[PDB]
Design a protein around this ligand. Structure first.
Ligand SMILES: *Cc1ccc(S(=O)(=O)N2CC(OC)C2)cc1
Ligand SMILES: *Cc1ccc(S(=O)(=O)N2CC(OC)C2)cc1
Ligand SMILES: [Cl-]
Ligand SMILES: [Cl-]
Ligand SMILES: [Cl-]
Ligand SMILES: [Cl-]
Ligand SMILES: [Mg+2]
Ligand SMILES: [Mg+2]
Lengths: 228, 8, 228, 8
């Protein structure tokens, strides 16, 4: 989107969100990133929301088709169309990872921005891992783990236990442990420790920050209820 | 459940 | 989709519906139509469902953006992005109308198939009319009216008052009268007469056909409740 | 309301 102003791309990305035009919103934010300037807190959220929606719809479709495909294995069309959706999903994940690698992460010097992008990197490698089956699945899983772990290390050094990004990072890393890494006990332990340390820090927060943190704390509890 | 993260 | 089998396109269109991948589903059905063979009852429904979903999402986005645009008139980005969505919407409508004109309608000899395609023609000209503002809006409206009217004439000669396509055609033609043609009294009269004549014909139906017809009869009543 | 027509 090289001929459009950065501010216009950002403004149109907000309009696309309101219109629920998430593919447009992602293309706008991709153009904004490629302007080469760092992203503000709000702009990072727009980037993340845009691609989470796009890849979320692809993941849901992939799961529908993969389930039909496995039932048929109890012509080639079902596998072909699953492969087509799967290829588009991997393309979106590779696109996001390319934005993070060129050059969002290396220019993110603050903990809030660096943890945010590393959380994103873990998420989109996790999405790749969900459909991986061959020689690279283990390497893809380790790339997810490595990204999440570096984000965890920084967030524990640099952010309070109630920080929404720190909480969301831990939530997603615990889903990674349970769903991808076949480590349900690690998943449960991370969610428990994350919830308990946030609980003990709630007294420091304003009413608005209290609302933000307890919302994600509830997601951690929902998983623990499901896992234990 | 992961972060829904689909609304800003 | 010239290199894919007709049956494979149809099978993949059903898979795309299950995955809620409506843009894929429409592209598959467009490929199936362009094989040049007439469509069965079920295949016509797949074509219609695919494009109704695609254009439905575009219409909802257009309305969100047009509302923001009008509020701003109480930079150019809002108008530009509305125009972009609007251009894509008109492209999908032109695509469907091109399929109907080449050559679905001229080969539809049965009343059920011909009324179905003419109803489609009215609908997609109606969608064009919803965003039309210039020299062609009146001609677009008349193209919608003409398509609906020919479908009405055939359906009244050839189908029972309870036929679901006849009922859906009358429902949509009444929405055309109310929303597009500024003829709310014509809209109310068509809906009333359609409902009453279907009611008097319900005694002829099986339980399953009774369910199909009364469902669309309820949509007619919902509009009448809103309009009177 | 027109025919929803979005499910086969
Ligand atoms: C991964 C993730 C964690 C937290 C959120 S949020 O609570 O909705 N929020 C956005 C804002 O960023 C500073 C905090 C969203 C996604
Ligand atoms: C425009 C329209 C009218 C009726 C229907 S339906 O009742 O769901 N149905 C599909 C089938 O076609 C013969 C009857 C859908 C759309
Ligand atoms: Cl500039
Ligand atoms: Cl395919
Ligand atoms: Cl063939
Ligand atoms: Cl635009
Ligand atoms: Mg920097
Ligand atoms: Mg014929």
């Amino acid at each position: 989107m090289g001929s459009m102003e950065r501010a216009s791309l950002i403004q149109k990305a907000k309009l696309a969100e309101q219109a629920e035009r998430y593919e447009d919103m992602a293309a706008f934010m991709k153009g904004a990133v490629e302007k080469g300037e760092e992203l503000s807190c709000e702009e990072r959220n727009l980037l993340s929301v845009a691609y989470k929606n796009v890849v979320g719809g692809q993941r849901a479709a992939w799961r529908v088709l993969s389930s039909i495909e496995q039932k048929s294995n109890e012509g080639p069309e079902v596998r072909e169309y699953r492969e087509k959706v799967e290829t588009e999903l991997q393309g979106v994940c590779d696109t996001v990872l390319g934005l993070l690698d060129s050059h969002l992460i290396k220019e993110a010097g603050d903990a809030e921005s660096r943890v945010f992008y590393l959380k994103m990197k873990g998420d989109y490698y996790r999405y790749l891992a969900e459909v991986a089956t061959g020689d690279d699945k283990k390497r893809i899983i380790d790339s997810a783990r490595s990204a999440y772990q570096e984000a965890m290390d920084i967030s524990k050094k640099e952010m309070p236990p109630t920080n929404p990004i720190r909480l969301g990072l831990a939530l997603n890393f615990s889903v990674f442990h349970y769903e991808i890494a076949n480590s349900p006990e690690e998943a449960i332990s991370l969610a428990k420790t994350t919830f308990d340390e946030a609980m003990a820090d709630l007294h420091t927060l304003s009413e608005d920050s209290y609302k933000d943190s307890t919302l994600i704390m509830q997601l951690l509890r929902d998983n623990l209820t499901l896992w234990t | 459940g992961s972060i829904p993260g689909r609304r800003s």
